Amino acid sequence: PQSSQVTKRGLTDPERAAIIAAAVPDHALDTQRKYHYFIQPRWKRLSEYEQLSCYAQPNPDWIAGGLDWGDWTQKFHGGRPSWGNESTELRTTDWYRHRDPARRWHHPYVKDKSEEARYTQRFLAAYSSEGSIRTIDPYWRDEILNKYFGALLYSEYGLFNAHSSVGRDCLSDTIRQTAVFAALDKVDNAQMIQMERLFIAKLVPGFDASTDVPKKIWTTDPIYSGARATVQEIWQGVQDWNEILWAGHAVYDATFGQFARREFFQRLATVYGDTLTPFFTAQSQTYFQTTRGAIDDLFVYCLANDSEFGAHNRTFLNAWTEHYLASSVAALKDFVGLYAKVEKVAGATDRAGVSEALQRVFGDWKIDYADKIGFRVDVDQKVDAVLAGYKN
């Protein structure tokens, strides 16, 4: 017999359920059963995603979109508000307008990544039992993949940490969700690169999955010099949370990151007989496209076309793009020196091949981001600036 009462449940205990039934009215006291029915729906019907996310952030009317009133109850020493307009240069009539087109609240997001988590481990168990690593090119495996794909994990890790102040500073709930999920996918990319290296180490005697050599390459090899400078600036040089998100995902990761992940490591895997690396880059590229859907909605649909501040916001976005595209072009110009270390494959690692890869990256970027904010870009000029770093 325990010291405390064994509480009777009102759902099942006869005496308490009878008391409850006598208390419960015999009719509903209102007919509006839609949770937060007053949200303005983005789509033809209010979504559960919106109902659970929108106006969770308790902004007052002096932050655009807020429904509350009055000052915060406690501010920073000196007076910095809990959240405030000073956090970013961009302006809008309603910070709540943003919608992730994938409609991710927490549950669908961890549900999908759980699928990938478990399937990845079944895939590895079977890939090791298959022996398929036997046909990978050993120089690619040991000298290019291990070392420079490994070093790329530090770019992903830095973009992850650039989100820390965004998670604190940004001004609405759907934005904060978009940013935090983007950060987890970036640190996931870094962890999956290391997971692949650790996995190859179990199959290839003498293959070293220590990060010592990748990290030396990230921190001191000229090939990653421009890239590391840009990441360091996006992560720790600025605090405007819109600038971090734009520079990080819409400029740097969409040009340098897409080139490194998709045009170098993923594409060249399927020229050097690497049946393992495409399984891993499939995940980072899926994540990139999901993140882009949300980044695009925040900056194109909402901020670049806001009825009162669209042109104002394009002034800042165009200035950020000019600076960070220069940084990213310099990163790519450094990075294409890596082609001097790979076995020549016509149409892939020769000058024409690299030129067409750069034409894809800069051309896709012009369509996906630059045209949508009014940023003029000469693609051939950017391709030629990077090719100045290519050793013929």
Partner 1 sequence: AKREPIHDNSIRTEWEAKIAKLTSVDQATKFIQDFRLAYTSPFRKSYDIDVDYQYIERKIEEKLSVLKTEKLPVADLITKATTGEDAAAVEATWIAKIKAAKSKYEAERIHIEFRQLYKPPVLPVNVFLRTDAALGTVLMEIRNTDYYGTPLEGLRKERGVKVLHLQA
Partner 2 sequence: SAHNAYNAGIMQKTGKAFADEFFAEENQVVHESNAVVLVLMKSDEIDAIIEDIVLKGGKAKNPSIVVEDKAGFWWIKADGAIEIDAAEAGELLGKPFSVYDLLIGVSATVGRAYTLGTKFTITSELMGLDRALTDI
Partner 3 sequence: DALKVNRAPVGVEPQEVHKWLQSFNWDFKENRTKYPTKYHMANETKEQFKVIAKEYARMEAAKDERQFGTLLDGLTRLGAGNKVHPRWGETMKVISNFLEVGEYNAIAASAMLWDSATAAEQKNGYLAQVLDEIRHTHQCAFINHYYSKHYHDPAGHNDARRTRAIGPLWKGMKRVFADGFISGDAVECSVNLQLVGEACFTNPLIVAVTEWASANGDEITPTVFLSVETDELRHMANGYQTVVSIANDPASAKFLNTDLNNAFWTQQKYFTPVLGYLFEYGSKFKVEPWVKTWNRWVYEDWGGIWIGRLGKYGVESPASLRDAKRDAYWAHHDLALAAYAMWPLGFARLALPDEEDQAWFEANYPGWADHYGKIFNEWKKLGYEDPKSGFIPYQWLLANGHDVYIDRVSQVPFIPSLAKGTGSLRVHEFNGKKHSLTDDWGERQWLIEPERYECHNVFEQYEGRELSEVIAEGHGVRSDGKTLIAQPHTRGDNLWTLEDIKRAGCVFPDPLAKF
- Residues 302 to 321 in contact with partner 1, rule: CB under 8 A: 308-309, 311-312, 315-316, 318-319
Residues 6+ apart with CB under 8 A from 224: 151, 154, 155, 217, 218, 334, 335
For position 82 contacting partner 1 by CB under 8 A, the verdict is: no
Q: What is the number of residues in the chain?
A: 392
- Check residue 122 for interaction with partner 2 (CB under 8 A): no
Both tokens of 386, joined, read 């990077």
The DSSP element (H or E) to which 297 belongs, if any, is none
DSSP 8: P
Closest CA to 102 of 152, 43, 161, 155: 43
Q: Could you write out the DSSP letters of every residue in 139-150?
A: HIIIIIIIIIIH
Out of 42, 46, 100, 297, point to the residue binding partner 2 (CB under 8 A): 46
- Contact between 191 and partner 3 (CB under 8 A)? yes
Which CB atom, from 243 or from 309, has the smaller least distance to partner 3?
243
Any contact of residue 28 with partner 2 (CB under 8 A)? no
Binding mask 140-169 for partner 3 (x = CB under 8 A): -------------xx--x--xx--xxxxx-
**What contacts 154, CB < 8 A, 6 or more positions away?**
190, 214, 215, 218, 219, 224, 228, 231
Instruction: Quote the CA–CA distance of 326 and 230 in Å, as a whole number.
Output: 10
Does residue 120 touch partner 2 according to CB under 8 A? no
State the minimum distance, in angstroms, from the CB of residue 248 to partner 1: 15
Closest CB to partner 1 among residues 77, 344? 77
Contact between 25 and partner 1 per CB under 8 A: no
Measured between alpha carbons, how far is 245 from 169 in angstroms, rounded to an integer? 12
Query: Of 43, 76, 340, 371, which one interacts with partner 3 (CB under 8 A)?
Result: 76
Q: Is 33 in the site for partner 3 (CB under 8 A)?
A: yes
Exposure string of 237-264, with b = 16+ CB inside 10 Å and e = fewer, is eeebbbbbbbbbbbbbbbbbbbbbbbbb
We find the least distance from the C-beta atom of residue 64 to a copy of itself, in angstroms, to be: 32
Provide the strand spans (E) within 213-357: none
Residues 6+ apart with CB under 8 A from 245: 166, 179, 182, 295, 298, 299
CB nearer to partner 2: pick between 47 and 194: 47
* CA–CA gap between residue 353 and residue 241 (Å, rounded): 37
Of the residues 195, 201, 238, 385, which one makes contact with partner 1 according to CB under 8 A? 238
Neighbours of 152 (CB within 10 A): 24
The nearest distance, CB 232 to partner 1, in angstroms, is: 15
- Rule CB under 8 A: choose which of 53, 57, 59, 87 binds partner 1: 87
In angstroms, give the least distance from the CB of 34 to partner 2: 8
Residue 91 interacting with partner 1 (CB under 8 A):
yes
DSSP 80-99: --SS-GGG-S---S-GGG--
Instruction: Establish if 36 lies at the interface with partner 3 (CB under 8 A).
Output: yes
Choose among 314, 318, 330: nearest CA to 252. 330
Per CB under 8 A, residues contacting a copy of itself are 11-15, 17-18, 21, 112, 114-116, 118-119, 122-123, 125-127, 129-132, 134-135, 262, 266-267, 269-275, 278-279, 282, 285-286, 288-290, 292, 348, 360, 364
Per CB under 8 A, residues contacting partner 1 are 60-64, 69-71, 76-80, 85-89, 91, 238-240, 243, 308-309, 311-312, 315-316, 318-319, 322
Per CB under 8 A, residues contacting partner 2 are 2-4, 6-7, 9, 44-51
